[PDB]
């Protein structure tokens, strides 16, 4: 029915929020310290000097266990 | 259909999963460190010593902002 369709449509969204915002591709797993945004995957969290979300510095990348994973 | 209930249980584990294992009523939103356990809100994270899924000491807690956050 329709009601599948948007059900559909909300897991899809919900499960697009887990991936890395930058590579779109891995599951985020890693948070910029100090500043706390948690947005991407540990490759593209490695490669960045500055969050991409708030443009804090990262002093270190602290890796995350979810019980989402 | 019965596929709209399948899919509005795998929708509703997935949200049961981003709940505090503790009080299981706020999401998760803390960090306990180092070890990287994620599984519980500020409110229940701030009063353990120890990680309440491998036991490792905690350091500290951070605060985590997700995407999913609602
Ligand atoms: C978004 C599309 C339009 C037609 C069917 C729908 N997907 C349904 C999946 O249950
Ligand atoms: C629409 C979402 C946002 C982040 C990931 C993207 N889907 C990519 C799947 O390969
Ligand atoms: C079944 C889930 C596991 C953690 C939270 C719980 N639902 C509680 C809703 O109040
Ligand atoms: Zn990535
Ligand atoms: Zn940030
Ligand atoms: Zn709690
Ligand atoms: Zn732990």
């Known amino acids: 029915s329709q009601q599948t369709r948007v059900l559909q449509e909300k897991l899809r969204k919900l499960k697009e929020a887990m991936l890395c915002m ?24 490695a490669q960045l000097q500055s969050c991409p979300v708030c443009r804090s510095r990262v002093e270190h990348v602290q890796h995350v266990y979810l019980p989402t994973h």
Not at 22 to 45: D, L, Q, R
């Open 22 to 45: 930058v590579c779109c591709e891995e599951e985020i797993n890693s948070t910029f310290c100090p500043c706390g945004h948690t947005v991407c995957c540990e490759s593209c969290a």
